[PDB]
Amino acid sequence: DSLAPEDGSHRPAAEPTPPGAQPTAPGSLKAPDTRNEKLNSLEDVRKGSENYALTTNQGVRIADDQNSLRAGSRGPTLLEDFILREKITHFDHERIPERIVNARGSAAHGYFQPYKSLSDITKADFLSDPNKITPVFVRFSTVQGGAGSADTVRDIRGFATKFYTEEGIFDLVGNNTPIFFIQDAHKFPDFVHAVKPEPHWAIPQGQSAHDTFWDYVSLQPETLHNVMWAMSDRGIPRSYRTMEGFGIHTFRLINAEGKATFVRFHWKPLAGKASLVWDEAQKLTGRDPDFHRRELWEAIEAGDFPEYELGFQLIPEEDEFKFDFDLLDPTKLIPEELVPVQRVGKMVLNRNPDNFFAENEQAAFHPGHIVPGLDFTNDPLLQGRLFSYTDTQISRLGGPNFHEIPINRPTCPYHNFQRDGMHRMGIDTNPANYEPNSINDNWPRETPPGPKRGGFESYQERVEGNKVRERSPSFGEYYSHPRLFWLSQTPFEQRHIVDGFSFELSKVVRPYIRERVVDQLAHIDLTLAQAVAKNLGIELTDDQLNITPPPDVNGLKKDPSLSLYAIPDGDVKGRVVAILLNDEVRSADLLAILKALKAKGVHAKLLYSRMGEVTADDGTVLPIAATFAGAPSLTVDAVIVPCGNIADIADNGDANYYLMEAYKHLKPIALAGDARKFKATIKIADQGEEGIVEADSADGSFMDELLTLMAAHRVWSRIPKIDKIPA
Amino acid sequence: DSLAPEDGSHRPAAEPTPPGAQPTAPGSLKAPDTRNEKLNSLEDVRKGSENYALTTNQGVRIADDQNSLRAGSRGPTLLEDFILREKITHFDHERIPERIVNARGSAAHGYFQPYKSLSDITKADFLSDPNKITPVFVRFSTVQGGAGSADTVRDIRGFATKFYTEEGIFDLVGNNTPIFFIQDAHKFPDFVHAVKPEPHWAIPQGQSAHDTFWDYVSLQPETLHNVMWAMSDRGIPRSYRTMEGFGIHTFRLINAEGKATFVRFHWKPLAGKASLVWDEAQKLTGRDPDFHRRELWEAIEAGDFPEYELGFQLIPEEDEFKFDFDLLDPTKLIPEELVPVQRVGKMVLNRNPDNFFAENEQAAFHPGHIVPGLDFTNDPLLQGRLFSYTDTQISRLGGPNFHEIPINRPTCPYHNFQRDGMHRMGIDTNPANYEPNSINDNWPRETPPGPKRGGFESYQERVEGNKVRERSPSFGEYYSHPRLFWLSQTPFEQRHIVDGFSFELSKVVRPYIRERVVDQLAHIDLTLAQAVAKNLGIELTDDQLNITPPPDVNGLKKDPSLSLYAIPDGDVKGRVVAILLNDEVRSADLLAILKALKAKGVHAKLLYSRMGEVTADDGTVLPIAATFAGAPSLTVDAVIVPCGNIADIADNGDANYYLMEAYKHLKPIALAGDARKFKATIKIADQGEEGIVEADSADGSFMDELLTLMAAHRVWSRIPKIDKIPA
Amino acid sequence: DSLAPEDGSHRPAAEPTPPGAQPTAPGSLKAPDTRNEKLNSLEDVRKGSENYALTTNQGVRIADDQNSLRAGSRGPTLLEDFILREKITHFDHERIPERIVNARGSAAHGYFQPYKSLSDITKADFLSDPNKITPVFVRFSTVQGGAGSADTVRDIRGFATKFYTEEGIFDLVGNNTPIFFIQDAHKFPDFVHAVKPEPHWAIPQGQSAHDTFWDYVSLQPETLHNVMWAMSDRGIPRSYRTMEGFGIHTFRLINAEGKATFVRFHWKPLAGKASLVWDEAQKLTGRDPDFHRRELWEAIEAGDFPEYE
Amino acid sequence: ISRLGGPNFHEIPINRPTCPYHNFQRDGMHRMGIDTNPANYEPNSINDNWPRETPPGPKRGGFESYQERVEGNKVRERSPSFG
């Protein structure tokens, strides 16, 4: 109809722009030049739209897409309207089953590149040449909730990477915590059923705060390690860009000589580690249930590409038994103070998808998708995972040919004797559909193992024992890793952990379940146990108070790599600041604030009590991003209030509340000139306090103080001060 | 490896070769230069094989495809064998549901072209110019049987054509008889359940000769007309090349002025019409159940392209009620005496598929797929057909994106706002997935109806009446069309119809049902009635004898276009002759025989009592295509026995039976020199018999009498003489 | 309504009758007194028909099952005809994928009874008591052909028995020859692809007589033992009642003490062994493609019950 | 049918009518009912046409649509009164 506005304002600029600045859009419309080989091979299935006639699926042009065919304009719909019928039919079949676990996820395209050849330890082609680029597709996710639940729940996050190598798809399907809850895959369905919504009423969504989770945990102490991690701030990351990633299981690297090495896979966030605080995370599920999805997407459109360093913990075959814990036990971490992570390569995520359904929702990852140069181990959880995935994927995607869906295909077409199945797209021409054959001179052919481009051979690990359904006795230790984790956290991290356990156990209706969790916490650490106990109105028995603590892990009293914050790794590029305007902002302060933010790659959003524009003292017209209520403090990393007619907003409940919520959630607050009248709102002494930047104006110094606070992410020293303000 | 023979005799030549000369092969390897737009756009999905490494579906190379992974070479299979599991999994899911009806079918690629422009009567783009070449994909099929049943059963045949036009797909989904068994689609599941295998035990396959079929026919006299056609020789085609094709329903052609014309579609075989005889047909379901599928594929590989003339019966709107039957009643035909068929264009099938499953099994046809220039009518069977197809196709193929399976795709990409669904291949980039929208400037957009390239508009037919579940009174006449068909058949064709009803009714267990059918035949024609009654040991009653025959159809009393044979139209090109050899063949006859057959494009198969070769009297070395028992006479159109050492085979029971069988089935037999010794086996008088070529040697003249007989297909005058042939 | 004949000859006698005397019927109407534990528990799902009104799937009675709803008796069919839509819709979805292998098969219900207690060698509840009977469900089949293929082809036959024991279902999934064609399950799809119809033209149905099968056999000599049996008259049995059956693999019997014993399972036809000859078998696929299915069902209706040891 | 898995979704417990339904529809994925009707079509004489159509009436009758008069041309048009 030519409904677009005459001005071109409906379509974003195909260049990197700041979050909130332009309508977001499909990846290849937004960043047409961001390319790689996999992204280039997808061009054959991308479809355009502009300037085409509207058609049926069979190519017939549609004249009237507003009406059904009927006998009279007020008469009955006629069965012969095939156009109406195809439209409703497709719509009626849009949905597919969501993943059993990790149904909520957000994904992006990018590339990986190794720093140096790793040929001495692995013949994996993607690790052999630093001038070589392997396209990747990453999907991050939550675990428990549906595809439509909230992003910022407390939970473990999945972190799956598909590597389209030259010798096959390698999928590195890991999580954001280095261990899992259970030891043997046989218990996956019991554990997952316990954390998922309870069967009689399907409640609660996206939460482990319910009886069944804690019943299970209280009966299966192998779970306490990963439960500590989830109860901590690790359970509620600030963003997918600011969390670690782990393969979890011990795998094998295999070189050209046949030497096998043990490896654990790590991803280090180049943006540093950072998480929200519980009240903030919970509230954020209400105000913006898509916060992680949006943030990841907008980060990529702004050019703040999520960057991660692939790292390896390497353990020679001869040191297999040299630890306190079993290397093949997935509830056990390998302390970096014992086995350091070696830097291997870098992954950059620089393009969003075009169609979430087509690329994200249909993407299929599998930990069994390994390439020559890698191999498994006998880890019993990994071993049972090797059976799931493909199984579930055919159910979910419609057939065994789901490897032909565009996102899932290798960069080089495969050749084998597999035929038919639902929705077969390739048309095979080989005369032979079996091997060995003589009618196609045996093609395609087997390829011996070799140093490069050889066929897949499993490592000839020795196998010895009886056929038994038995847990290895070396896996029977459950409290020493949870304790190592506990001792490595800072004091404010310990309290957050205490509050995580306290909050969750309080949603457990059956009191005895709470008491049993407390009993288990008393086997990890007495100080942890007493503080949780106290929050539940429980007193430990004398016996509980004398439980002897678990042994150290290989003599360690702590390991600082396990804390999010003990060792500062801050980075503010990509963070965002809220700027509370008034109806006559001193433009001098605004100019100084925005330019300083911009120099460090920090984003800003101009907020007011209404939408539209406000005009600064010199006549500068300032466009408003969102209102105070519309873009709450939960969504920003810090707040700045410029001088101006402060009386315009000083009595605005939403304005004041904005600073109270941000102060409560430990965020840096900066007040310029008369904005300092808000100090009374958050009870700040005349003197001032650490975490509150204030001055007569927003000069250079003022912005450097604010940015330094931003580099340390939150104002932990404010904790005792927040207790009292009602917010 | 190198399993193929060093001579290179595993590969068939990429040139037209006669039936059984070379191993058959996928169309693209057999005839790589036979092309059309559709065939060329499928090129992006065709896969090679030669010279490729064997890989998983993820592209990982397989070293050993002979063995499962185990703990020790005599041990248990390990769950971690992802190669085995991938291979078994895909194998586990190969099969998809067969079509509910017309499961058994054979298909080929080709092209259509009009003879002249039809723009005075339709704006359909494919009919607009004789230079407009339209790619087609045709699927011929039986109706009742499963995907694995026999080709030469007695049954109706389906004849489906997919036209890939420049304005969308138009599927012409017809049968090989001009009417259907029932009038309203409400009864399709009742009719089909009655003809299909009975529910308690699932017998019988591919046969209407059981009680439920004949019970339903006896209780539903609307069925009698198509029943007549099925029981005639029309029900047992020689081949898909030698049968007619019909759309059955009256449709509409709409021109650019908006004028509507009623039309019925015809497909006229340029190879002419030909059918087997019942016992040959039933015997052939056991010696070669794939006969028709085989013959179609090999005709094409030989360059004997199946060719059909598209024909239209055109009826002015104003003539709607000018006949003594309803135009909209699908159990009524339109005699070509009353409304002649106008030749409109020709279709040629010239290329077999590459993979049966991918292109034939997954093909989807819909009578509802029409294009501007065409429209429906109120025919109640066609109307209800538009509630089916799509629905069934989504459960067979697996999803609402089956239009994206390569064979089903329109030549040019479609644009609409439909999204997702299982196995979505298209990656959409439109910022808008709805309309109207301003964010993509309302694209893709509607297009008004017009002369060419316009959107679809239904002809505005007036609808008047009450919402009722009621049969039109005009449709209640069930006997005059069956009688017209009966009076138009030759006397041997009449006799074949009697035998069909008699044979079928003999298999009905409940005698009362046999009598109810005979009672129906008495309403059609007394002679047919008595003849069937007599074969069942039934005596017509007094009352049945005085039944007045139904009225003539618009004065007609026969219509030679309804008979298969009344008007000679045979074609010998592509037929096959069996040549019975001996160890001392007279090479003077072979050359002459082969020189004469090849001049009229008749193929030959050299048959002996063992395989390998025989040596001619002059030393010519003859390769044997098959044995007498391996390639029985049922598979040829005529049998020739050249002179030589007849003593070598005169006492061969297989040789003698071959001629007795060919004789009984009315096929031409040629006997040279001492071959006239075989006359005794088929008891032929010394002066000879019309239909038995005999001469002193196989000269030109002898070959000419053989070719002339073959042009007449079968020797109808031998019928009375086969009675006393124990074969 | 009065469609059945007045004499009542539309209905088969509910008693053992010989082949072709009466129209065959569903077992429970043919032999209502026949019973076993599994046949009795299938009762809650069986449905009658006589004297019931015709209804939709939601229980709405149907008045006119002959016509679609339209605007005028000659007018267009309306989308609001929910009775027509349901009927066509269920019809449209009737078929399911056939089995990958063994798609063509015939089955029947029955019972098993051990001659004596086997507790010395196995703790299996179904072999512990001679007065204890186990309901079974057996399906015989060919291997290569589709569900609509012919019975008397030359092929191996499947012999599968479902034991409904008191401690769980035990399925004995065997064949009518004591060995299989291949050694490692990894090659099953290769082998099966070779015997099945060749990929380009989907020919030939229900036959191993084509190039790919013999090619595979010639390159894989492990197949020659089962090939020998298939090329013999074992490949074309007279009936499923007159062929042997085998588990093929060595399994294990475990007693209460934990003592293992190697075992191979066998089925002996009390009717003895009998096969057709090649030409009779091939012509039969043309004259009666359902010969073995018919024969089995008819033997049961006649009281000539398939018996196996 | 796509969501729940087949045309027999009326047989999932929660969806079943209180009184058994009877018709000639057969098969489909996950068929729970075991039909014993000798006939799977109508009209049939082998089960004396059961189950049968029931004429409409005041109580317990077959479904009959109201006979609304239909008048107009086949159009893809919004009624102007809806505007």
Ligand code: HEM
């Ligand atoms: C170390 C332990 C595990 C980790 C790190 C892990 C990780 C993941 C991740 C990240 C995903 C989502 C991938 C995506 O975004 O599509 C996922 C999905 C899944 N996981 Fe695992 N998982 C673990 C254990 C298991 C086990 C023991 C099983 C069962 C044997 C299992 C079964 C599944 C299934 C069935 C899916 C859905 C996949 C799909 O629908 O494509 N997981 N897992």
Ligand code: HEM
């Ligand atoms: C004049 C009457 C009819 C004719 C000539 C006819 C013709 C055909 C043909 C030729 C096919 C097979 C196409 C192929 O090769 O894939 C077919 C399939 C089919 N027909 Fe029709 N048919 C008729 C009536 C009906 C009716 C009344 C219905 C239901 C109301 C129906 C339902 C179907 C279904 C469900 C299929 C299977 C479609 C698929 O799975 O792709 N047919 N019919």
Ligand code: HEM
């Ligand atoms: C000793 C060798 C084997 C024997 C005796 C055997 C026997 C059978 C039988 C009798 C059936 C049909 C059962 C029925 O009536 O439903 C069958 C089905 C089947 N077999 Fe086996 N088979 C053998 C080897 C294999 C192997 C090695 C595989 C795969 C690795 C396999 C996969 C299948 C499949 C996929 C089916 C279809 C079953 C269904 O859909 O319900 N068979 N087999």
